[PDB]
Amino acid sequence: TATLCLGHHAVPNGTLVKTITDDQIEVTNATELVQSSSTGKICNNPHRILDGIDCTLIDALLGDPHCDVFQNETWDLFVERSKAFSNCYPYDVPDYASLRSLVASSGTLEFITEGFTWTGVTQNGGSNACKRGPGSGFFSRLNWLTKSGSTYPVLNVTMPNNDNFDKLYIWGVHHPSTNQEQTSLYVQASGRVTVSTRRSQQTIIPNIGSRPWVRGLSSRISIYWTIVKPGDVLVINSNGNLIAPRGYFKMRTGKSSIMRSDAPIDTCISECITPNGSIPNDKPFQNVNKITYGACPKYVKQNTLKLATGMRNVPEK
Amino acid sequence: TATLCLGHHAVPNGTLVKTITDDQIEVTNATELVQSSSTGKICNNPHRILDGIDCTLIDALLGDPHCDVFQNETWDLFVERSKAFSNCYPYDVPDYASLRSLVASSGTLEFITEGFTWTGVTQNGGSNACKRGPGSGFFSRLNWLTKSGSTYPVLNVTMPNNDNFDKLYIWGVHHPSTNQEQTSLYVQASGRVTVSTRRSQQTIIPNIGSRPWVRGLSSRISIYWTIVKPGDVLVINSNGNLIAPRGYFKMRTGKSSIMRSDAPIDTCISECITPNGSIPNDKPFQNVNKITYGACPKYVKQNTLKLATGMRNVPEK
Amino acid sequence: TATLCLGHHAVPNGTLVKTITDDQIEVTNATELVQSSSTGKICNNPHRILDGIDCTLIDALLGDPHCDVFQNETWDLFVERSKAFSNCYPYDVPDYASLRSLVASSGTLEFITEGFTWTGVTQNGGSNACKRGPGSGFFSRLNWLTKSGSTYPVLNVTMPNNDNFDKLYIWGVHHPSTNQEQTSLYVQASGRVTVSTRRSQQTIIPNIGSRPWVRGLSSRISIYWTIVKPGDVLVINSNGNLIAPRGYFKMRTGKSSIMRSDAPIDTCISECITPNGSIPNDKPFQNVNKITYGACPKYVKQNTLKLATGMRNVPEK
Amino acid sequence: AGFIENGWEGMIDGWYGFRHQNSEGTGQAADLKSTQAAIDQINGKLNRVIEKTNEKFHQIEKEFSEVEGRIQDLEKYVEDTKIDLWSYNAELLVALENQHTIDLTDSEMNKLFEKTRRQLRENAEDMGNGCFKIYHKCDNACIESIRNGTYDHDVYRDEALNNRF
Amino acid sequence: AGFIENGWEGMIDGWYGFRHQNSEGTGQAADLKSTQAAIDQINGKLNRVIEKTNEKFHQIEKEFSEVEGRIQDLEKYVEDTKIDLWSYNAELLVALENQHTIDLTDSEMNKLFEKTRRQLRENAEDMGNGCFKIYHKCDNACIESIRNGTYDHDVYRDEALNNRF
Amino acid sequence: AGFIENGWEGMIDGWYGFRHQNSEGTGQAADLKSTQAAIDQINGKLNRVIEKTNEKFHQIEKEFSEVEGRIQDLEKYVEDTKIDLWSYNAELLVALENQHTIDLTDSEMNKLFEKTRRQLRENAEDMGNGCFKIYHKCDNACIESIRNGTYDHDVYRDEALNNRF
Ligand SMILES: *[C@@H]1O[C@H](CO)[C@@H](O)[C@H](O)[C@H]1NC(C)=O
Ligand SMILES: *[C@@H]1O[C@H](CO)[C@@H](O)[C@H](O)[C@H]1NC(C)=O
Ligand SMILES: *[C@@H]1O[C@H](CO)[C@@H](O)[C@H](O)[C@H]1NC(C)=O
Ligand SMILES: *[C@@H]1O[C@H](CO)[C@@H](O)[C@H](O)[C@H]1NC(C)=O
Ligand SMILES: *[C@@H]1O[C@H](CO)[C@@H](O)[C@H](O)[C@H]1NC(C)=O
Ligand SMILES: *[C@@H]1O[C@H](CO)[C@@H](O)[C@H](O)[C@H]1NC(C)=O
Ligand SMILES: *[C@@H]1O[C@H](CO)[C@@H](O)[C@H](O)[C@H]1NC(C)=O
Ligand SMILES: *[C@@H]1O[C@H](CO)[C@@H](O)[C@H](O)[C@H]1NC(C)=O
Ligand SMILES: *[C@@H]1O[C@H](CO)[C@@H](O)[C@H](O)[C@H]1NC(C)=O
Ligand SMILES: *[C@@H]1O[C@H](CO)[C@@H](O)[C@H](O)[C@H]1NC(C)=O
Ligand SMILES: *[C@@H]1O[C@H](CO)[C@@H](O)[C@H](O)[C@H]1NC(C)=O
Ligand SMILES: *[C@@H]1O[C@H](CO)[C@@H](O)[C@H](O)[C@H]1NC(C)=O
Ligand SMILES: *[C@@H]1O[C@H](CO)[C@@H](O)[C@H](O)[C@H]1NC(C)=O
Ligand SMILES: *[C@@H]1O[C@H](CO)[C@@H](O)[C@H](O)[C@H]1NC(C)=O
Ligand SMILES: *[C@@H]1O[C@H](CO)[C@@H](O)[C@H](O)[C@H]1NC(C)=O
Ligand SMILES: *[C@@H]1O[C@H](CO)[C@@H](O)[C@H](O)[C@H]1NC(C)=O
Ligand SMILES: *[C@@H]1O[C@H](CO)[C@@H](O)[C@H](O)[C@H]1NC(C)=O
Ligand SMILES: *[C@@H]1O[C@H](CO)[C@@H](O)[C@H](O)[C@H]1NC(C)=O
């Protein structure tokens, strides 16, 4: 006679996995399905990464003197840093988060200057709170209009959209610290700014008073925006406190976004970006972050998941 | 001896399905779980479908002269068309989307006229921008109040809810194009409209100025609404620019909704409506649209899913 | 020879469960995975439960005379009752729901009085609509400022945050019923209240007019709030209608929340609270409610789910 | 097995069955009990066992004609999240259901085989091709007795064992 | 099998076991190793293997007393979406878990049967009713030897084969 | 089985295979068809069978530096809901996939065993330890014939049955 024995391989040291019927079963091999680490750096390929160094996207949009390098810049991902700071005339943006989202998803700061004509007013006013070069200045994409001589007319300007794309207009309203400023700056006891299209309008009333001092100023500027579609018309009506647009930003649609991260950017390639740096995307899940951009693994709570890649390991003994 | 062979059937041409262990396995039969097509038409049964032909729900609500056919109409589903247009005094609705949602879910335009008494004012003013018949007109559910003789009193009117249901009041505020209109129309340099209940109030200040011309007018009307519950009271206070309610809409709860579609409506029966037309609901999933109404299959990305309805197909060879 | 029979146990009366291949299969034993009932009572352990008896969280926050017992109180869960009512000067809170959420999640009404100095005005005004003791009164955390003698100066007060935590300030704006009240109360034809920080500002304009009568008053107070972070500064500017803060609420982060329930509270222990009372948390699912607090089972639609805890039951016959 | 080597394209009166060869020639018949059992399990599964159609009415807007900011971003996010999760559920469910259909139908075939093998006992051998070699003369009445569960192995052992050994 | 024909309502000392008849009369005993194995798999499954209770605190409002418009519509939508998905997970999970419980307990029964069959080797025949016919005298000590895994088939073949053939 | 008692730490040319002892001494060889079948099923499963990576771009904000009220509460709620559901899917999926891997690899081992048993027919006995006792002289050429599916049981029965009985 003869003996024919059937069997399978085993390994000296296997690994444990979980099944429906068993909490821990040893298997010959298992792989890891959760990516739990990053390189600590953001890769600059294949996506276009724009490092706002000390700028926020809104300061870059408005034209803060330290952000002059971002004029007409584009990105797939705009990266904000914790060290970013503003250094211009103090301002606020009602619904800041929406404007930040609109610009971030458009993906561009391409700006086209338009021939707005403002008559009977002094154009291009600035402040020592926004120095540009050795003297006073202002945001590069805004025009601070003030009285001319002893008057300030009601401004009524029309700017039609005869193009085949949407135009984004950024404008604002000045808020003087006192009654003695509003009548020396734009000779008006009660200003108003109205900006409208064929479908909607926004009217803003300035609010006089001292705020905490920021960069030497107790006054503020509020930022507002409007979108004009092809065939529509932009109309601006004001009797004081207008921080006029100088033109429009071209709007786009696409894959562009924004992230907050202090990670450095390097010469490597990775499709998945998290605020902790780029991660591999060769696993179905990750627990590095919830904030991701690009071709990323799904975020899960688990730090580890082991998937058997082989059979039960039963040692010889 | 004898031979007894056991086996199973096979078919000349089977179909492929996916399993956990196999990417493609041939089976005798398989069914399709994703509904990927529509008839291109909306069925008028069992649901009540209201085709707004050239009307939007809001124009039907306000009383645009082309929408006079929708007075006191009801629906389970209101259908808006891409060809719909407005043709009345130009207007805007702050938070348009919420009003559209409220009315759509109520499911009715039933309107009850109330005995509001407006004294010292001229009632029923109209415009050539909203012609009704051969002459001027206005929205049928609104009352444009203007000066009487040389004055305009402050209007203070009270309308209690002694009923057992909620009342929806639609009202608005006029926005003149100029200082020379507001003092000839309702003799007032600065108008205000305040509408309130025992729980909340809304005060609107009119904004003077020219907007782009729509149907010959540079002026606008803003639409606002309030809901008065049983036991509450409606109070209206104004010193100019009031587009008064003429009564209230009766509010209801239920299955009613709204959809945007250019699909035609026909004499067929289907429980599931999508903007591409009605679809069968005999499959658990569909990929026709994400916008659905009624007893619909779940929307999935997949264009196809095959479910084996039989065993593996192994041909004789 | 001999017979050796192999088999398994059976029970006289088994239970039915559902599987992938069978709609109903009898098994020896099965357990219930859906918790479908409550005790009808809320347990006061391990969580700290604060029964607002006739108070809402906002009345407790503002200082309604019936809620004086909740001063400096804390909770893990604040419980509102359907019988709760207000009994003070009539008020409204724009975005009521957000303030209710902020306070509920902070978990405390700890209040610190600050040395605000209001000069040229009369402090601590009250009303017969908010009686405290036998005479007139007001909300305990607010200061109603009115004219002094024949004047009312513009108030400009600064209160810096030099602490290491966020400060919540509650303040409001008075809305007189008439032009004959606003000039006798705070001698001003047009009041305004501006409250600001280094990052944002709020300016409120009062609205004159009669509202439905509540507790004998046709006038109203609107409630607003602001948060001042460490290093920031609170600035208040007003020329009339200011219901001043008396200090700040200390903000916290944590597990605290709010629930609406008419269930009584008792001396028992339970980690899961629903508005129908506490429930056991020894099952993975529940269908008692969707509103839960603490270590609760997941809410499902199903009233029952049976999980086999044993084998198929096949009776002897 | 013979049911691994192939199926029968010539079997149309059921899903599972028998084919035979004896002194009277050849023949075929479906087994209706295993055919119906496989069918009942499948018809159940193809029905609303773990899922059903839900009826929905008023819902959020899913398409937009304007750029709005935060609320619209959240509405889109919520809808995309819902779709990804239901698309996942559809893939997993179909692959699980198909895995179970293949396994239940292969098992019904193996059950019929074991059922037959123990009826035959020692009077037949498993040839490794889904067939049993019966070691005694077994005419058409005998084959039907095996097919309907009434074969008595005790009246054949004396012949069958002589032919096997 | 006999374990398909029925279970034993008279077996209370375990889940799986043996029943026998010999020259000393009849008897019964549970098999504790297969009983415990089935129990351990089940007790694991009934525990937090793929799910656990999460502790939640402040959340969105889920009930409303007023008609608000878009935000409320989105809040309701988000909550309904969550409930439909968890209700689905509960149906699929329970049906999968029950499918696995039935399959693991049927398998433990079949494992005991195969285990017994190979201990007996050629000294017994499978009668098709979950029973083995043992072809040699097998007294109560013999039956326990089979039950505890110590049966030596080599001391019985000479008798058992004479009785089988 | 012998494949339950243990695996072979000495088998490195495949996953499943044969080990033998005969008159020429001992030896070992992997079975490549069952090894590859187990591998193909696993490599498929480890790939994007029921799931794939989705590419996402602009999304909602998930972290906040300020206390905002209702919108922020809803955004957080939506994200937590998404995470709990995907975390659940990951637990269930991995446990199901691991359950299927163990079951398919145990089944491939049992298939090789049954395949061998029916090639041997009556010329061998199952010893209960994953081994077949072959009752005829079977040299290295014979063992390879069994291993590659060409063993002819009809040329050995006359010897094998004399040794078995
Ligand atoms: C198994 O791993 C341990 C460390 O966890 C090590 O000490 C041991 O030597 C390893 N054994 C083998 C056989 O590789
Ligand atoms: C086991 O899986 C790992 C991946 O985690 C792989 O690197 C390794 O080569 C595999 N080993 C075998 C024996 O296939
Ligand atoms: C931005 O692009 C426009 C395109 O017409 C061009 O006119 C303008 O000069 C560019 N500005 C900068 C800073 O390059
Ligand atoms: C108002 O208060 C600020 C401090 O925040 C102070 O700097 C400013 O001079 C004050 N202005 C008036 C009107 O007195
Ligand atoms: C990176 O991961 C850590 C957890 O280890 C987390 O605390 C941190 O917030 C993540 N990165 C950022 C900047 O979001
Ligand atoms: C199978 O389908 C193909 C077309 O895809 C057809 O050409 C072929 O003739 C069909 N074969 C049988 C046996 O029906
Ligand atoms: C196979 O399934 C289809 C449904 O896709 C059905 O129409 C057809 O009749 C079925 N055929 C058989 C053989 O049952
Ligand atoms: C609408 O219904 C009310 C119910 O009282 C009725 O008075 C009114 O005349 C109806 N209007 C139309 C257009 O039918
Ligand atoms: C304001 O500009 C518009 C063009 O949009 C024009 O029609 C209107 O007459 C102008 N009005 C004034 C106040 O000059
Ligand atoms: C109908 O389906 C198509 C995809 O083929 C889609 O583009 C379209 O938007 C759908 N219908 C509507 C009007 O939503
Ligand atoms: C089974 O339960 C029914 C009630 O549903 C009862 O009448 C019957 O007597 C019970 N039978 C046994 C054997 O316990
Ligand atoms: C069956 O399960 C229930 C829990 O529903 C338990 O109370 C009972 O003791 C169990 N019975 C057995 C026989 O284990
Ligand atoms: C609330 O706590 C503060 C802490 O400084 C204390 O000054 C104040 O008196 C306390 N108030 C009450 C009602 O206990
Ligand atoms: C305004 O109407 C109310 C009733 O809501 C009344 O009590 C009040 O006296 C009226 N006031 C005026 C200004 O006549
Ligand atoms: C308690 O459960 C019932 C359903 O029986 C439900 O109607 C009720 O709303 C729940 N409790 C509360 C107060 O939410
Ligand atoms: C089985 O078939 C035989 C031969 O045709 C017949 O005599 C017998 O009565 C049948 N038994 C049953 C239960 O149908
Ligand atoms: C098995 O049972 C027999 C008879 O009772 C006894 O002699 C033997 O020692 C037992 N063996 C074990 C391992 O329990
Ligand atoms: C199987 O092995 C034998 C002995 O080595 C050899 O003669 C035969 O040709 C092989 N057959 C196949 C199909 O490889």
Residue numbers in the entry:
A (entry chain E), B (entry chain C), C (entry chain A): 10 to 326
D (entry chain D), E (entry chain B), F (entry chain F): 7 to 171
From the article:
Hemagglutinin (HA), the most abundant glycoprotein on the surface of influenza viruses, serves as the primary antigenic target for neutralizing antibodies. HA is a trimeric glycoprotein with each monomer composed of a globular head containing a vestigial esterase subdomain in its lower portion, and a stem domain17. Each subunit consists of a membrane-distal polypeptide (HA1) and a membrane-proximal polypeptide (HA2). The HA1 subunit is comprised of a globular domain (residues 116–261) formed by an eight-stranded antiparallel β-sheet motif that includes a distal shallow pocket corresponding to the receptor-binding site, surrounded by the five immunodominant epitopes (A-E).
Both the HK/68 as the Sing/16 H3 proteins were purified from HEK293T as well as HEK293S GnTI- cells, in which N-glycans remain in a high mannose form as they lack the ability to undergo further processing into complex-type glycans. The cryo-EM structure of HK/68 was resolved to 3.4 Å-resolution and is highly similar to Sing/16 (Ca-rmsd of 0.68 Å), demonstrating that the overall structure was maintained over time despite a relatively large number of mutations and the addition of PNGS. We observe density for core N-acetylglucosamine (GlcNac) moieties in our cryo-EM reconstructions at all PNGS on both HK/68 and Sing/16 except at N122, which is within a well-resolved region of the protein, and N8, which is near the N-terminus and is part of a poorly ordered region of the protein. Difference maps calculated by subtracting the aligned endo H treated maps from the GnT1- maps reveal the full extent of the glycosylation on both structures, highlighting the nearly complete shielding of the head domain on Sing/16. N165 is the only conserved PNGS present on HA’s head shared between Sing/16 and HK/68.
